[PDB]
Antibody
Framework: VQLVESGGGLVQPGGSLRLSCAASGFNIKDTYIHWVRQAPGKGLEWVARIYPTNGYTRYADSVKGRFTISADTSKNTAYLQMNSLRAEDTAVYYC?????????????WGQGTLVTVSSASTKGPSVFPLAPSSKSTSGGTAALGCLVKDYFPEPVTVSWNSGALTSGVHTFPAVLQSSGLYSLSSVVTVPSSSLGTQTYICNVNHKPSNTKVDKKVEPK | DIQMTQSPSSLSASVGDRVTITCRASQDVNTAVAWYQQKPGKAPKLLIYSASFLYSGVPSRFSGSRSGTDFTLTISSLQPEDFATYYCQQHYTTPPTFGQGTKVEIKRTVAAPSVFIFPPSDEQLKSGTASVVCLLNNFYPREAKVQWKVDNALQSGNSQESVTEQDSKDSTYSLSSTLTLSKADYEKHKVYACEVTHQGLCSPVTKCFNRG
């Protein structure tokens, strides 16, 4: 079973957005579909639901009249038309499904899409290596990373040697610079025995600015 | 709209502890309750459905219980991979509602940070801003202090911290602290150090470099 939220990003206060929930592996006719939302650092607030066969929806006070859930049975998809948007509705937006007819827990969820409600501009991150120390103890453990700096909005996804290097990887939560812009880092620790030999490349994705950097962090 | 009152809001337990989290519904809700675990960045996973049933693919050590309006999720033997917030939801009435949720931090042996300091890149320096990054790797507890010393002169208002949620394997944390300076400002000094203070250290550790 899979549920894949699309069409979420940056949007002006007052402005519109239409979240897409793509099902596969089951017919959305045979169940209810929900849109649950997590504001930065807060808990899950349920927002709306729909029985795709009839299209009988239910919505939360905070969102009633303003947002509108619907379902295209053909593409196996659910939508959240979102309008009159504000700082309140800046959160992650999950799309989930009730089980069967008599088991009404929420067994499957999307990965979620961040909706940020600013009218600040999108901005693309620069990437800069964090290069392993010359000193290199003598042959124990070295660190190295990519700084990712001055992007808006969230989020940023960093991988390493394209998915091939996962152990020792610490992609820090981002920090908001007074400039109103974001910056994080990602670091990996690795056997100092291997700085020349092996190649370490960080892959930086910021979809908001369609950005793909593949920076090769060399010693110095 | 039924309210769901969650206890506690936070919890540290150790590996091989029974931990138990309670949820109290305002009005009655039958068996109409599910227990979900959400990991950092990741979306919630079903753990328990109808208060006492153990979803498919949920390890046996999880279990749920109903005594009247009071609902209890139990981890018989806490494992590092259990780090998460866990939320109780009732679905008896619309809107289905959630507890504020319970933050389970694993509690392990005091661990000393490894410290590394990274000079700005050549290529940032060419853009007239200097990023000096102090890293603290795989310490416990989550509570630390990093100070920045430029030519032994302590700094303030010009650095920014960020801490990883607790690692899933070793229950440790890591911290990034970032001093920023106009290339102009950076080039007026040579000795960059960051002082680090933590439980696992019987003395403060300082990593440093000279600009050159």
């Amino acid at each position: 079973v899979q549920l894949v939220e699309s069409g979420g990003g940056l949007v002006q206060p007052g402005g519109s957005l239409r979240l897409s929930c793509a099902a596969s592996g089951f017919n959305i006719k045979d169940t209810y579909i929900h849109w649950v939302r997590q504001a930065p650092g807060k808990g899950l607030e349920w927002v709306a639901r729909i029985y795709p066969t009839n299209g009988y929806t239910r919505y939360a006070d905070s969102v009633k009249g303003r947002f509108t859930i619907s379902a295209d049975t053909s593409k196996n998809t659910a939508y959240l038309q979102m309008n009159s948007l504000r700082a309140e509705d800046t959160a992650v937006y999950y799309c989930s499904r009730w089980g069967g007819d008599g088991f009404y827990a929420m067994d499957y969820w999307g990965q979620g899409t961040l909706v940020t409600v600013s009218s600040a501009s999108t901005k693309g991150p620069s990437v800069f290596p964090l290069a392993p120390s010359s000193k290199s103890t003598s042959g124990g453990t070295a660190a190295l990373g990519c700084l990712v700096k001055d992007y808006f909005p969230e989020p940023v996804t960093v991988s390493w040697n394209s998915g091939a290097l996962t152990s020792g990887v610490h992609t820090f939560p981002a920090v908001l610079q007074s400039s109103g812009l974001y910056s994080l880092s990602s670091v990996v620790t690795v056997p100092s025995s291997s700085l020349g030999t092996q190649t370490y490349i960080c892959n930086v994705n910021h979809k908001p600015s369609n950005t793909k950097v593949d920076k090769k962090v060399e010693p110095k | 709209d039924i309210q769901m009152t969650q206890s506690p809001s936070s919890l540290s337990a150790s590996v091989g502890d029974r931990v138990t989290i309670t949820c109290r519904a305002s009005q009655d809700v039958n068996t109409a309750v599910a227990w979900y675990q959400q990991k950092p960045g990741k979306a919630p996973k079903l753990l328990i459905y109808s208060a006492s049933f153990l979803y498919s693919g949920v390890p046996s050590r999880f279990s749920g219980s109903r005594s009247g309006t009071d609902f209890t999720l139990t981890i018989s033997s806490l494992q590092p991979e259990d780090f998460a917030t866990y939320y109780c939801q009732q679905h008896y009435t619309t809107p289905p509602t959630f507890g504020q949720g319970t933050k389970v931090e694993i509690k392990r042996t005091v661990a000393a940070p490894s410290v590394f300091i990274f000079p700005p890149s050549d290529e940032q320096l060419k853009s007239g801003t200097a990023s000096v990054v102090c890293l603290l790797n795989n310490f416990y507890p989550r509570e630390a202090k990093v100070q920045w010393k430029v030519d032994n002169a302590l700094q303030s208002g010009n650095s920014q911290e960020s801490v990883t949620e607790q690692d899933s394997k070793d229950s440790t944390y890591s911290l990034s602290s970032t001093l920023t300076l106009s290339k102009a400002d950076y080039e007026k000094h040579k000795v960059y150090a960051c002082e680090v203070t933590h439980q696992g250290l019987c003395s403060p550790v300082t990593k440093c470099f000279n600009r050159g």
